[PDB]
Amino acid sequence: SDSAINVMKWKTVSTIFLVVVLYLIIGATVFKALEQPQEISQRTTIVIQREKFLRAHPCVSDQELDELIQQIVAAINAGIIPLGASSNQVSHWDLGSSFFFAGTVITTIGNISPRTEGGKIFCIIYALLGIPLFGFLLAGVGDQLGTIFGKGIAKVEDTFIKWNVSQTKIRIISTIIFILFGCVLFVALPAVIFKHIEGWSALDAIYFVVITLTTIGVAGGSDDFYKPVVWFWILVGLAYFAAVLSMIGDWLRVIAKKTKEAVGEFRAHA
Amino acid sequence: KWKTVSTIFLVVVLYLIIGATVFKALEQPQEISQRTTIVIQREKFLRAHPCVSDQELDELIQQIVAAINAGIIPLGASSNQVSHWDLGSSFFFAGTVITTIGFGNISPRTEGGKIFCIIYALLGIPLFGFLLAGVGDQLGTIFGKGIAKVEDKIRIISTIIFILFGCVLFVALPAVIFGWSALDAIYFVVITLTTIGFGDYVAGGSKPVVWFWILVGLAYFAAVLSMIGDWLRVIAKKTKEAVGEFRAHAAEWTANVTS
């Protein structure tokens, strides 16, 4: 009973391991079909600019022009706009831009990293202590928003109450109005807002938000009335996708137990 | 009823103001040094080669800026490099998305790739969360059976054996598995396994057994970052009573001053 269920558990996780392995193989085979065509077009035509610019200017050193670009590529990862025109520059660590990157570290959202030892060592501890600190703010807003929605759904679930009202199915009308109100607020409105400031397309504003509020991975700059109100949204939108990504785990745990019985029957009866 | 979250809000706002003022003191100095000396290599290149002119170095950067969205190119890419999105490199980036490590130096450019990735993340992040949590309690008994040995003040000697004997494993080996510097191996691991994300893969210019360690190391920092929340919850309630006293004693103090 103590380690008997643990022989049951090692199975259940080793199986999930293979689901993710397949899921990565699937994603790999999909991304290599979607992106590797677009990459060859870019490289095989960037050779033509390489091949042009050596013939546009033969007197520059050939092998060293590669090294010159490599030293630019390596020196892009800093705060970098290197030119004799636009040599005057702003700091990527100014009054508010370092405030930004402090905000990414504790959120674990994420080209410009610190280069100082003291910066790297402070950041290690700033993260190891700021990530848990932020976790309480996120969870605090998570249940703060949980009652903003809990009181809003206490009204909605009463306004269809006729005779013959089932309590197991109105729970699903509520889960519809949460993806509905949610993605209208947190996915629809900001994505439309970034079209009229940065000029983003229709997709890339939603692609941005999903990658952002899932903390996987910018429109803050415009070259201070506009960042502080957005950082609010980010915190609440992070609490939003925190619930959303957790909901999907509820579905995936249902789908697991439903495919669990399906294989059990269809291999027992056959 | 009592909110208590608006209070924590100010702690993080304060804590961001702290970090901001610290990082601007640590990094804005080294930012000047590099950039004002990068001008010196640029100011030499115009002089080392009048062949390439002022207007043309703008064009040369513009073609790099355009080729940042793609990557690194022909000769530095045929003598040193392979093509991205290949058999196993797209396996990598699929692995970053579900872990939310999100290295993202090469993001997808196709709309279909971006839409697939949105759903691949929205469905892969929860899927991976059970593998992580499954390994978390899998490792929880790997460590639970190791402490049944040790338990046969001592509560804190054990917590030393978990930070030491864990972090000795997870910063020495994994960074080397995937010389070096002493700090950046640990800086790499902390950024990686906290899922802030994977500090700069290097190609040496000038899979299955590894993703084991990353999965276990993620489960490791998942517990580590969670333990600190336990102590930060303790430190909060320890500082809660301290202000309660030191405002209560000063309150009666003032009642004595009246007489």
Ligand SMILES: CCCCCCCO[C@@H]1O[C@H](CO)[C@@H](O)[C@H](O)[C@H]1O
């Ligand atoms: C299993 C433990 C192995 C311990 C040996 C540690 C030394 O690693 C070596 O680091 C060198 C990079 O500077 C590479 O040149 C070698 O290929 C690599 O082997």
Ligand SMILES: CCCCCCCCCCCC
């Ligand atoms: C992209 C999602 C792939 C999901 C693969 C599911 C495989 C289920 C196998 C169940 C075996 C018991």
Ligand SMILES: CCCCCCCCCCCC
């Ligand atoms: C009421 C919460 C305030 C205490 C939490 C901040 C102190 C922990 C930060 C790290 C200090 C070493």
Ligand SMILES: CCCCCCCCCCCC
């Ligand atoms: C970085 C450490 C910050 C500590 C600031 C403490 C804020 C006061 C807490 C008051 C609790 C009632």
Ligand SMILES: CCCCCCCCCC
């Ligand atoms: C090598 C310089 C180390 C600087 C560490 C700064 C730590 C700041 C703690 C408040």
Ligand SMILES: CCCCCCCC
């Ligand atoms: C939605 C496909 C994921 C697989 C879930 C079921 C796993 C047993």
Ligand SMILES: CCCCCCCC
């Ligand atoms: C472009 C719209 C994508 C919607 C994704 C929904 C995934 C459940």
Ligand SMILES: [K+]
């Ligand atoms: K993350």
Ligand SMILES: [K+]
């Ligand atoms: K990240």
